[PDB]
Amino acid sequence: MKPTYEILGQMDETFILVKDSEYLYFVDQHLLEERINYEKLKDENLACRISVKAGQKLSEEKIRELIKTWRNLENPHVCPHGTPIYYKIPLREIYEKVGRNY
Amino acid sequence: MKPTYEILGQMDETFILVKDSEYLYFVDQHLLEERINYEKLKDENLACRISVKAGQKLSEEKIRELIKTWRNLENPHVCPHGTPIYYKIPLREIYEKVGRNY
Ligand code: NA
Ligand code: NA
């Protein structure tokens, strides 16, 4: 994700929505914190058990911290168990569906 | 869209994001206001020219009014010119990508 981005908020207390000029990302809060903790601790089970779970509301500040850190991970793409950390939509698919150039 | 829904906000001053239990909708603010005005006025050119344009920031209240009215349109799907009013993502595609049931 590009360095200029806009955080749109939490969805279902499970995903952080954040976009740059190319994609809208839906970032799984548990998988992201688990990757952050795993890269620090190098322990898959420990990183999992201490991380936030889906269904927890997160503050705006905590959300900003997580997204900032996501960009600097060695592996921002998959958690230690191999699950994708996020789903992404190219913004072009949204614009093109309504007939707008992008 | 179901009667219980959550408005997530504006994106790029062009789309309103709103979700129910099944889909996340990206609603083109211009196409929606144009449909609202067209169903009232029955004049395609008039409805277009008086409607909000992309690139205008909208207040939370105006966004609530638009989404409420969208649900009650005779044709909530396409504008008078035939363009889709919105793009939709099934929530299952977001959850399934990160390995979550939905
Ligand atoms: Na351990
Ligand atoms: Na006219």
Coordinates of C-alpha atoms and ligand atoms in Angstrom, one line a residue:
Chain A
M1 CA 0.0 0.0 0.0
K2 CA 1.2 3.5 -0.9
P3 CA 2.5 5.8 1.9
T4 CA -0.5 8.2 1.3
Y5 CA -3.6 6.4 2.4
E6 CA -7.0 7.1 4.0
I7 CA -8.3 5.0 6.9
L8 CA -12.1 4.7 6.5
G9 CA -12.8 2.9 9.8
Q10 CA -13.7 -0.5 11.2
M11 CA -16.3 -2.8 9.7
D12 CA -18.1 -5.5 11.8
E13 CA -15.5 -5.0 14.5
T14 CA -13.4 -7.3 12.3
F15 CA -11.8 -5.4 9.4
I16 CA -10.1 -2.1 9.1
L17 CA -10.9 -0.4 5.8
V18 CA -8.0 1.6 4.4
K19 CA -7.4 2.8 0.8
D20 CA -4.7 4.3 -1.2
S21 CA -5.0 5.6 -4.8
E22 CA -5.2 2.0 -6.2
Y23 CA -7.0 -0.4 -3.8
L24 CA -9.5 -0.4 -1.0
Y25 CA -8.1 -2.9 1.6
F26 CA -10.1 -4.8 4.2
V27 CA -7.5 -5.7 6.8
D28 CA -8.4 -8.5 9.3
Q29 CA -7.5 -7.0 12.7
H30 CA -6.7 -10.3 14.3
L31 CA -4.4 -11.5 11.5
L32 CA -2.6 -8.2 11.3
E33 CA -1.9 -8.0 15.1
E34 CA -0.9 -11.6 15.0
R35 CA 1.6 -10.9 12.2
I36 CA 2.9 -7.9 14.1
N37 CA 3.4 -10.0 17.2
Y38 CA 4.8 -12.9 15.3
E39 CA 7.5 -10.8 13.7
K40 CA 8.5 -9.5 17.1
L41 CA 8.2 -12.7 19.1
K42 CA 8.9 -15.5 16.5
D43 CA 6.3 -17.6 18.3
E44 CA 3.1 -18.5 16.3
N45 CA 1.1 -19.6 19.3
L46 CA 2.1 -16.7 21.5
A47 CA 1.5 -14.1 18.8
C48 CA -2.0 -15.6 18.2
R49 CA -3.1 -15.8 21.8
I50 CA -2.1 -12.2 22.8
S51 CA -3.6 -10.6 19.7
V52 CA -6.9 -8.8 19.4
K53 CA -9.8 -10.9 18.3
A54 CA -12.6 -10.3 15.8
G55 CA -15.5 -8.7 17.5
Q56 CA -13.5 -6.2 19.6
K57 CA -14.1 -2.5 18.9
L58 CA -10.8 -0.6 18.3
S59 CA -10.1 3.0 19.0
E60 CA -9.1 5.3 16.2
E61 CA -5.6 5.6 17.7
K62 CA -5.2 1.8 17.9
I63 CA -6.4 1.5 14.3
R64 CA -3.8 4.1 13.2
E65 CA -1.0 2.3 15.0
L66 CA -1.9 -1.0 13.4
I67 CA -2.1 0.3 9.8
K68 CA 1.2 2.2 10.2
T69 CA 2.9 -0.9 11.4
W70 CA 1.3 -3.1 8.7
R71 CA 3.1 -1.1 6.0
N72 CA 6.5 -1.9 7.7
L73 CA 6.1 -5.6 8.2
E74 CA 8.5 -8.1 6.5
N75 CA 5.4 -10.0 5.4
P76 CA 2.3 -7.7 5.2
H77 CA 0.4 -10.3 3.1
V78 CA -0.2 -13.5 5.1
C79 CA -0.3 -14.4 8.8
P80 CA 2.1 -17.1 10.2
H81 CA -0.6 -19.8 9.4
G82 CA -0.7 -18.7 5.7
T83 CA -4.1 -16.9 5.8
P84 CA -4.3 -13.6 3.7
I85 CA -4.2 -10.7 6.1
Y86 CA -6.6 -8.7 3.9
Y87 CA -9.0 -8.6 1.0
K88 CA -8.5 -5.9 -1.6
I89 CA -10.8 -4.4 -4.3
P90 CA -9.2 -2.4 -7.1
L91 CA -10.8 1.1 -7.0
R92 CA -11.3 0.9 -10.8
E93 CA -13.8 -1.9 -10.4
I94 CA -16.0 0.3 -8.2
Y95 CA -15.7 3.4 -10.5
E96 CA -16.1 1.4 -13.7
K97 CA -19.3 -0.3 -12.5
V98 CA -21.0 3.1 -12.2
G99 CA -19.6 4.3 -15.5
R100 CA -16.8 6.6 -14.1
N101 CA -13.2 6.8 -15.4
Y102 CA -10.5 5.7 -13.0
Chain B
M1 CA -30.8 -3.6 0.8
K2 CA -32.3 -4.8 4.1
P3 CA -33.9 -2.3 6.5
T4 CA -31.2 -2.7 9.0
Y5 CA -28.0 -1.2 7.6
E6 CA -24.9 0.6 8.7
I7 CA -23.6 3.7 6.8
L8 CA -19.8 3.6 6.8
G9 CA -19.3 7.1 5.3
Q10 CA -18.2 8.8 2.1
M11 CA -15.3 7.6 -0.1
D12 CA -13.4 10.0 -2.5
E13 CA -16.4 12.4 -2.1
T14 CA -18.0 10.2 -4.7
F15 CA -19.5 7.1 -3.1
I16 CA -21.5 6.4 0.0
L17 CA -20.5 3.1 1.7
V18 CA -23.4 1.3 3.3
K19 CA -23.8 -2.3 4.3
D20 CA -26.4 -4.7 5.4
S21 CA -25.9 -8.3 6.5
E22 CA -25.3 -9.5 3.0
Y23 CA -23.5 -6.8 0.9
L24 CA -21.3 -3.8 1.2
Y25 CA -22.7 -1.2 -1.3
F26 CA -20.8 1.7 -2.8
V27 CA -23.5 4.1 -3.9
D28 CA -22.7 6.8 -6.5
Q29 CA -23.9 10.1 -4.9
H30 CA -24.6 11.7 -8.2
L31 CA -26.5 8.8 -9.7
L32 CA -28.6 8.3 -6.6
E33 CA -29.6 12.0 -6.3
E34 CA -30.3 12.0 -10.0
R35 CA -32.6 9.0 -9.7
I36 CA -34.3 10.6 -6.7
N37 CA -34.9 13.8 -8.7
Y38 CA -35.9 11.9 -11.8
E39 CA -38.6 9.9 -10.0
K40 CA -40.0 13.1 -8.6
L41 CA -39.6 15.3 -11.7
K42 CA -39.8 12.8 -14.6
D43 CA -37.2 15.0 -16.5
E44 CA -33.8 13.4 -17.1
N45 CA -32.0 16.6 -17.9
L46 CA -33.4 18.5 -15.0
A47 CA -32.8 15.8 -12.5
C48 CA -29.2 15.5 -13.7
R49 CA -28.4 19.2 -13.6
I50 CA -29.7 19.9 -10.1
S51 CA -28.1 16.8 -8.5
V52 CA -25.0 16.8 -6.4
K53 CA -21.8 16.0 -8.3
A54 CA -18.9 13.7 -7.6
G55 CA -16.3 15.6 -5.6
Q56 CA -18.7 17.3 -3.2
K57 CA -18.3 16.5 0.5
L58 CA -21.7 15.6 2.0
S59 CA -22.8 16.0 5.6
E60 CA -23.7 13.0 7.7
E61 CA -27.3 14.1 7.7
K62 CA -27.5 14.5 3.9
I63 CA -25.9 11.0 3.6
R64 CA -28.6 9.6 5.9
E65 CA -31.4 11.2 3.8
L66 CA -30.0 9.9 0.6
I67 CA -29.6 6.3 1.8
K68 CA -33.1 6.3 3.4
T69 CA -34.6 7.5 0.1
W70 CA -32.6 5.0 -2.0
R71 CA -34.4 2.1 -0.3
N72 CA -37.8 3.5 -1.3
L73 CA -37.1 4.3 -5.0
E74 CA -39.1 2.6 -7.7
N75 CA -35.8 1.8 -9.4
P76 CA -32.9 1.8 -6.9
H77 CA -30.6 0.0 -9.4
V78 CA -29.9 2.2 -12.4
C79 CA -30.1 5.9 -13.1
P80 CA -32.3 7.3 -15.9
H81 CA -29.4 6.8 -18.4
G82 CA -29.0 3.2 -17.4
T83 CA -25.8 3.4 -15.4
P84 CA -25.7 1.2 -12.2
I85 CA -26.3 3.4 -9.2
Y86 CA -23.9 1.3 -7.1
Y87 CA -21.2 -1.4 -6.9
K88 CA -21.7 -4.2 -4.4
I89 CA -19.4 -6.7 -2.8
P90 CA -20.9 -9.8 -1.1
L91 CA -19.5 -9.7 2.5
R92 CA -18.8 -13.5 2.1
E93 CA -16.0 -12.7 -0.4
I94 CA -14.2 -10.5 2.2
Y95 CA -14.6 -12.9 5.1
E96 CA -13.7 -16.0 3.0
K97 CA -10.5 -14.4 1.7
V98 CA -9.2 -14.1 5.2
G99 CA -10.4 -17.6 6.1
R100 CA -13.5 -16.6 8.2
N101 CA -16.9 -18.2 8.0
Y102 CA -19.7 -16.0 6.8
Ligands
NA1 NA 4.9 -20.9 22.3
NA2 NA -35.9 19.2 -19.4

